[PDB]
Amino acid sequence: TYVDPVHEFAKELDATNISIDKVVGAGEFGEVCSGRLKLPSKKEISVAIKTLKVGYTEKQRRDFLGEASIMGQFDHPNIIRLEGVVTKSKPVMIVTEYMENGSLDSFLRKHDAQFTVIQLVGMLRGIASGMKYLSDMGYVHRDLAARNILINSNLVCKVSDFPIRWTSPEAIAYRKFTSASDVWSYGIVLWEVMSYGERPYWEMSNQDVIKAVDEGYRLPPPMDCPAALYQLMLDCWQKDRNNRPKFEQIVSILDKLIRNPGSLKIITSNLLLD
């Protein structure tokens, strides 16, 4: 079980063991960079590193470290790993799993139509497996989107970031956030992946995204989308949240498609009424 909140779930790292190799850019609370971490066993790994800005407020520090207090509760291959934090020296740091290929939406946009269907399904299965663990822990992510999935050098996808286009109708209507609203979001991620990082609902007015979805309109099948995967999207996007599949069921569906890749050969900016 997840517990809503730092040193209970995060290792205090010795800054001597951290080196910075490359500055990436600015983040919400400070700089973002990458580098290397020397583990207690002397193994050296690549890591992503985020710093808290100089002259931070106490609220900024709490909100920044709050990420680590959440991430550190999870230990799963498809959830970004927290290596630890530095708090006893400044700048304050959060050190996480290095992911060579960055955010999934931007990665896919660079590689439009360049992966096999089975490669894409493997990415999707990893995301679903991470979400099955989060939901098993009782954690509702609320921000599941391809931009919040990171992808490593071997194309393994992992949930990160601990949004009207990704939010279920009931969560928009009255803030009813449940694991079933994360399943809705997963359906949108499925569409994002099969579309190679197209923006869900493009740049439709937000009021129209809300109304169209309420009226029964759904994102159209991506080009060359397997029928099985478009059906899975529609299932994730059931109006009745109780009729959406559970994450365990999504993982099982994708595992069957991986085991029977022939099934993917059956193929299915305007919204379609469902």
Residue 50 sits in the same domain as residue 134: no
Given the structure tokens 């999935």, which residue do they identify?
149
50 is an annotated ligand-binding site residue: yes
Domain count, the chain: 2
Residue 42 sits in the same domain as residue 2: yes
Residue 104 sits in the same domain as residue 235: yes
Q: For residues 242 and 136, give the distance between their C-alpha atoms in angstroms, rounded to a whole number.
A: 17
Q: For residues 209 and 165, give the distance between their C-alpha atoms in angstroms, rounded to a whole number.
A: 7
Name the method of structure determination. Answer: X-ray
Domain-terminating residue out of 98, 121, 142 = 98
Q: For residues 268 and 255, give the distance between their C-alpha atoms in angstroms, rounded to a whole number.
A: 20
Measured between alpha carbons, how far is residue 93 from residues 18, 48, 183, 270 in Å?
Answer: 10, 10, 32, 44
26 is an annotated ligand-binding site residue: yes
Give me the sheet containing 31-38, strands edge to edge: 18-26, 31-38, 44-51, 93-97, 82-86
The contacts of residue 114 (CB under 8 Å, 6+ apart) are: none
Residue 80 sits in the same domain as residue 180: no
102 is an annotated ligand-binding site residue: no
| Secondary structure (3-state) at 122 | helix
Residue 119 sits in the same domain as residue 64: no
Q: Residue 214 catalytic?
A: no
Taking the CB of residue 259, how many other CB atoms lie within 10 A of it? 8
What DSSP string describes 161-224?
A: ---GGGS-HHHHHH----HHHHHHHHHHHHHHHHTTSPPTTTT--HHHHHHHHHHTEEPPPPTT
29 is an annotated ligand-binding site residue: yes
Query: Resolution of this entry in Å?
Result: 1.1
128 is an annotated ligand-binding site residue: no
35 is an annotated ligand-binding site residue: no
Query: Could you tell me which of 166, 171, 124 has the C-alpha nearest to residue 143?
Result: 166
Residue 44 sits in the same domain as residue 125: no
CA angle 5, 9, 11 (to 5 degrees): 135
Residue 83 sits in the same domain as residue 151: no
Residue 107 sits in the same domain as residue 48: no
Residue 103 sits in the same domain as residue 90: no
Residues in the chain followed by a break, C to N above 2.5 angstroms: 5, 162, 268
Residue 80 sits in the same domain as residue 204: no
CATH number of the CATH domain containing 12:
3.30.200.20
143, 161, 235, 255: which one is catalytic? 143
Domain enclosing residue 11, as ranges? 1-98
